[PDB]
C-alpha cells in the first residue's frame, strides 16, 4: 500500500454537514500521515481519546472514520465522550469508550453571513437521546404535549430542527466551528490503515 489516507479531503472540504445530518467518510486501505494534525498552530481544538497524539504514526487500525459537521463554539465541548447537551443528546453522540481524536476550528470567515446563514441546522427536540454514532434525519413534528400533532406544527407541536443563523458579528461562543471526528476502529480483522512504515 502506497496511497496516503485522504485526510486533506475532510479537513479542507468546502462544505460541512449540519450536525443533525453529520457526514461520515470511511478511510481504509491507505497509509496515514497525521502531519496535518501536528502542523497546526493550536488556535485549533485538538483532543484525543484513548491513544496519544504522539503515538499515532506508530499505529495501525482496521478502519478510520472521519465524521464532520458544523456546530457553535459553545457546543464543541459536547463532542467528547460522557458529555450532555442538545448536540451530544440529539445530534451526535460519542460513546463512553471512544477511541479517536476530535479536531475543531473557527470557521466564521466561511460559514457566517451578514444576512444570517440558516443552512446549518441542529436537532433540538427528540423524545430520547441518541445512541453513540446514531444519525436522526427525521423531520416529523415533535409532540411536546399529550395531544397528537397530526403532522401540523403548533402548540406543543414543534418542528424538531432549528437553524444556527450564523452572523459574523456573533460572539465566539456563537460563531460557527467546523469539527472533524476521527474514530480509530480495531476489530479481529486485518489492519487497513497504518502510520508511516507502521
Amino acid at each position, epitope marked *: 500500500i502506497t496511497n496516503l489516507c485522504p485526510f486533506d479531503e475532510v479537513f479542507n472540504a468546502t462544505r460541512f454537514a449540519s450536525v443533525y445530518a453529520w457526514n461520515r467518510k470511511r478511510i481504509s486501505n491507505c497509509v496515514a500521515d497525521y502531519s496535518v494534525l501536528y502542523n497546526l498552530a*493550536p488556535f485549533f481544538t*485538538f483532543k484525543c481519546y484513548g491513544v*496519544s497524539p504522539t*503515538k499515532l504514526n506508530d499505529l495501525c487500525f482496521t478502519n478510520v472514520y472521519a465524521d464532520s459537521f458544523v456546530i457553535r463554539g459553545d457546543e464543541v465541548r459536547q463532542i467528547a465522550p460522557g458529555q450532555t447537551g442538545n448536540i451530544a443528546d440529539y445530534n451526535y453522540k460519542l460513546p463512553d469508550d471512544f477511541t479517536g481524536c476530535v479536531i475543531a476550528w473557527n470557521s466564521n470567515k466561511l460559514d457566517s453571513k451578514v444576512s444570517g446563514n440558516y443552512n446549518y441546522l441542529y436537532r433540538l427536540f427528540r423524545k430520547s437521546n441518541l445512541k453513540p454514532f446514531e444519525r436522526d434525519i427525521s423531520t416529523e413534528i415533535y409532540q411536546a404535549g399529550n395531544k397528537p400533532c397530526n403532522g401540523v406544527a403548533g402548540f406543543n407541536c414543534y418542528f424538531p430542527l432549528r437553524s444556527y443563523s450564523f452572523r459574523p458579528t456573533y460572539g465566539v461562543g456563537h460563531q460557527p466551528y467546523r469539527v472533524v471526528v476521527l474514530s480509530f476502529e480495531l476489530l479481529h480483522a486485518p489492519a487497513t490503515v497504518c502510520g508511516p512504515k507502521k
Partner: antibody
Amino acid sequence: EVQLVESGGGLVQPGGSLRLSCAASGFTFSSYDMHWVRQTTGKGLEWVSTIGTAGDTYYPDSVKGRFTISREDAKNSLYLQMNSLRAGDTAVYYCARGDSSGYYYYFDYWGQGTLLTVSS
Amino acid sequence: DIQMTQSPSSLSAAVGDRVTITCRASQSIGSYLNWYQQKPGKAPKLLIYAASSLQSGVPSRFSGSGSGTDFTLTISSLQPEDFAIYYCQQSYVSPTYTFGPGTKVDIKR
C-alpha cells in the same frame, strides 16, 4: 541510569521572558516524547507542554500563545521558551519523559524541578 | 478536560498498616489511570500505570485497582519511606493530561 537535569530557573519580572533547559541522559533521547509539568501550592500538578518524536508540539490554552517547547536531539536537550510570564506562572517546573505500554500513557522519569518566580 | 478527585485529603497511618487511597474521575476513563508518589523536595515518581501495572522498581507493597470511574491505590504495609503525597492521573484525554489534588499520607509513630 536515566537522569533529567533542570536548569534556567530564577527570578523574572512580570511580562518578562525566560527559557528553561532540561538535559537528559541514560536513554535514547530522540526516541522518547518529552513534557513540561509544573506544580503550584494552590493548583497542584499542571501539565504545561508536550513534544513528540515527529516535531509535534502540544499546549494547554493557558500557555498556548506564551510558551514554546523545543528539543535538540543532537544534545539530548529540552527547552521551554516562556514569554509574557505572569505572576501565576510562579511554579516548580519538571521536565518529564513520556512513554506508553500499548495505548496507556505515563510519565516515567522526572527531573529535579526548577523554581520560576515572576515578581516585581 | 476530565476533573480528577482524590480522597482522603490527609491520612495518618501506622507502620505496617494497610493504607487505601481513592481516585475519582469526572467520567469513565477505563483503565487509563496512573498513580504517582512525591516525597518532600523530590519530583513525582511513577508507581502505577494502566490502573494496576506496577512500574519497574516500585516495591510490591504498592498496588492499584479500579476501572471506569473509581480507582484505588493500596499500600499493603506502610513503610516509613512511604510518607509522601500521592497523585492519580488520567491518561484517557490527551494531550491535556490532568492530575488529582493529591493525598498526603502522614505516618503515625
